[PDB]
Design a protein around this ligand. Structure first.
Ligand code: FES
Ligand SMILES: [Zn+2]
Ligand SMILES: [Zn+2]
Ligand SMILES: [Zn+2]
Ligand SMILES: [Zn+2]
Ligand SMILES: [Zn+2]
Length: 96
């Protein structure tokens, strides 16, 4: 299992454990965290986070393009971790 450090823009930090075949958002919600989402299918931006450290599998998503993925943007509803990682939450409105 992997340690996912979730950091919010308001300064909260929580570490959520998540398996390599488990979605980041699902894991966070199990842990009781209040995370944004809408379609839960990788086709919008509502659940967006930014991967600051570590590695995530974004293969199931469809909304972000290749350059956005490279910058670290990640739709957490269908993202799965590939390492311990640090992810900034609540990022929809910062998507560029
Ligand atoms: S909630 Fe729509 S892409 Fe994640
Ligand atoms: Zn810390
Ligand atoms: Zn669960
Ligand atoms: Zn929105
Ligand atoms: Zn580190
Ligand atoms: Zn682009």
């Amino acid at each position: 299992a992997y340690s996912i450090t979730l950091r919010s823009p308001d300064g909260a930090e929580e570490v959520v454990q998540c398996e390599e075949d488990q979605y980041i958002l699902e894991a966070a919600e199990d842990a009781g965290l209040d995370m944004p989402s809408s379609c839960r299918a990788g086709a919008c931006s509502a659940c967006l986070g930014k991967v600051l450290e570590g590695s995530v599998n974004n293969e199931e998503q469809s909304f972000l393009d290749d350059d956005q993925l490279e910058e670290g943007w990640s739709l957490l509803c269908v993202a799965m971790p590939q390492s311990d990682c640090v992810i900034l939450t609540e990022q929809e409105d910062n998507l560029d």
